[PDB]
Amino acid sequence: NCTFEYVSQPFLMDLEGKQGNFKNLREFVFKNIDGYFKIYSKHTPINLVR
Amino acid sequence: QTSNFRVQPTESIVRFPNITNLCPFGEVFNATRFASVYAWNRKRISNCVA
C-alpha cells in the first residue's frame, strides 16, 4: 500500500573541502501541519568541533 | 467635498502556473491491451493535473 511518491534534485551532498573536523553544517526543520509536511533546509560553511 | 472618484477597472485577468504536470490518462485510454472484466485492472492517479 503506497499513497504517495515524489522525487527531485538531490540536496544533502554539497560538501566543501576535503578534511578538517566537519566541513558544511546541514540544517533542517520538519513540521507537520494541516496534513502538509513542511521541510526547510540550509547549508553553511563551518570550521569547529561541537 | 461632494463625492468621490474611482477609476473603475477596465477588465479582469487571471494567471495560474504553467500547467504541466498532466495526469497519465494516455496509459489508461491508449494502453495496448486491457484487462479482463472479471479481473479488471486498477491504476491509482494522484499528485497530477487531470
UniProtKB/Swiss-Prot annotation, chain A:
Report the protein name in the record.
Answer: Spike protein S1
Gene source species: Severe acute respiratory syndrome coronavirus 2
- Glycosylated residues, per the record, are 1
**What task does this protein carry out?**
Attaches the virion to the cell membrane by interacting with host receptor, initiating the infection. The major receptor is host ACE2. When S2/S2' has been cleaved, binding to the receptor triggers direct fusion at the cell membrane. When S2/S2' has not been cleaved, binding to the receptor results in internalization of the virus by endocytosis using host TFRC and GRM2 and leading to fusion of the virion membrane with the host endosomal membrane. Alternatively, may use NRP1/NRP2 and integrin as entry receptors.
Task: Give the span(s) annotated as Disordered.
Answer: 9-21
Q: Which residues of the full protein are shown?
A: 165 to 214 of 1273
How the protein assembles, per its UniProt entry? Answer: Binds to host ACE2. RBD also interacts with the N-linked glycan on 'Asn-90' of ACE2. Cleavage of S generates a polybasic C-terminal sequence on S1 that binds to host Neuropilin-1 (NRP1) and Neuropilin-2 (NRP2) receptors. Interacts with host integrin alpha-5/beta-1 (ITGA5:ITGB1) and with ACE2 in complex with integrin alpha-5/beta-1 (ITGA5:ITGB1). May interact via cytoplasmic c-terminus with M protein. May interact (via N-terminus) with host bilirubin and biliverdin, thereby preventing antibody binding to the SARS-CoV-2 spike NTD via an allosteric mechanism.
Swiss-Prot record, chain B:
Superkingdom is: Viruses
What does the UniProt record say this protein does? Attaches the virion to the cell membrane by interacting with host receptor, initiating the infection. The major receptor is host ACE2. When S2/S2' has been cleaved, binding to the receptor triggers direct fusion at the cell membrane. When S2/S2' has not been cleaved, binding to the receptor results in internalization of the virus by endocytosis using host TFRC and GRM2 and leading to fusion of the virion membrane with the host endosomal membrane. Alternatively, may use NRP1/NRP2 and integrin as entry receptors.
Q: Which residues of the full protein are shown?
A: 314 to 363 of 1273
- Disulfide bond entries: 23-48
* Quaternary context: Binds to host ACE2. RBD also interacts with the N-linked glycan on 'Asn-90' of ACE2. Cleavage of S generates a polybasic C-terminal sequence on S1 that binds to host Neuropilin-1 (NRP1) and Neuropilin-2 (NRP2) receptors. Interacts with host integrin alpha-5/beta-1 (ITGA5:ITGB1) and with ACE2 in complex with integrin alpha-5/beta-1 (ITGA5:ITGB1). May interact via cytoplasmic c-terminus with M protein. May interact (via N-terminus) with host bilirubin and biliverdin, thereby preventing antibody binding to the SARS-CoV-2 spike NTD via an allosteric mechanism.
Where on this protein are sugars attached? 10, 12, 18, 30
Tell me what effect the entry lists for residue 30 to Q.
Reduced viral infectivity
Under what name is this protein listed? Spike protein S1
- For region Disordered, the annotated ranges are 6-22
